[PDB]
Write a protein that binds this ligand. Structure first.
Ligand SMILES: [K+]
Ligand SMILES: [K+]
Ligand SMILES: [K+]
Ligand SMILES: [K+]
Lengths: 193, 193
């Protein structure tokens, strides 16, 4: 069983907690319980990652100096853990079926950074391309945090994920970026970058 | 004194806490105490905003139904507050001069989403343009969270902020997006979008 490094564990924690906050907001925006449940499942992966980060960290330190540096890692993971649980608190609200004040969804759609639902049409130039090749974050400023494909959800999709007509992309980015990607997705704009 | 709405207060809280997390990571990456101090100052603005959100919220509810909806707002603000304090915990570490384990900066530079320092040269096409007109988030995928201009920091700059040669932009985005913006900033790529 090949050994993982502290860094790769740390990186997954950081990447994961950020995905969780995005999905938490998405679950509130669309009042979607499945997205919310994904957030709680990720919250457990965070706890697991944190445990491994601690195991690795602890064993790594053998002298005072090393110990002090290992502690800085644990402190940041602790802060990450707090952000994780906060995201979990947001998801719980959706899972409880609570009736949300209307300003909540509006706020999510009107902040500097929003969550948007993007329908992919048959004639769009992104149909048949992987996220890896499209690399939407880089090329559009829109970060794809999930895709609804029929009755299934693909959360935090790879660079290997290939887009199909009918897919519904859940993206994060500025309003303008989102509206832009929609036109592309609609096929109205037959060019990316 | 014109009345603010719950939404605008809520929006500033959400926008602000996100800026705080970005700056927290930036203060760790560059071991920069001034950025870290900005994070603690923002943490106070969050508390203030939260207080106002509570005042407004409380007064708004007059019946059981309204009260239940107002509570959903307070619950989310509470989660935001937890993310705020977590960001503050990260900044405290930098302010304490703690010696960071090397994996920390590497992790910030190697995650899915990174923090990058971008030098603007005299010959770059963005010199003399406002963020509003460049709207880098939309047009490049790079989110500018701050600018170091000489001996001064401008945090969370407006759409009215005009870029100058010599400015050092602090951006958030994918590695590829960041490297791209650097070429533009270098003037090597005389075209944006
Ligand atoms: K040890
Ligand atoms: K805590
Ligand atoms: K009342
Ligand atoms: K707490």
């Amino acid at each position: 069983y090949e050994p993982k490094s502290v860094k790769e564990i740390f990186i997954e924690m950081k990447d994961t907690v950020e995905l969780m906050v995005d999905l938490a907001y998405a679950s509130l925006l669309f009042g979607d319980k499945e997205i919310a449940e994904e957030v709680l499942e990720l919250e457990e992966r965070i706890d697991l990652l944190n445990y491994q980060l601690m195991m690795h960290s602890v064993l790594a330190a053998r002298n005072v100096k090393e110990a002090e540096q290992v502690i800085t890692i644990l402190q940041i993971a602790n802060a990450i853990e707090d952000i994780s649980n906060a995201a979990g608190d947001l998801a719980k609200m959706v899972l409880e079926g609570v009736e949300l004040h209307p300003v909540i969804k509006e706020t999510i759609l009107e902040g500097e950074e929003i969550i948007g639902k993007i329908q992919v049409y048959p004639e769009s130039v992104i149909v048949g391309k992987t996220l890896g090749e499209l690399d939407l974050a880089t090329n559009t400023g829109v970060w794809i945090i999930a895709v609804r494909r029929g009755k299934r959800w693909i959360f935090g999709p790879n660079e290997n994920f290939k887009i199909r007509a009918g897919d519904v992309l859940i993206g994060r980015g500025t309003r303008t970026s989102i509206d832009h990607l929609k036109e592309i997705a609609r096929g109205a704009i037959r060019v990316i970058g």
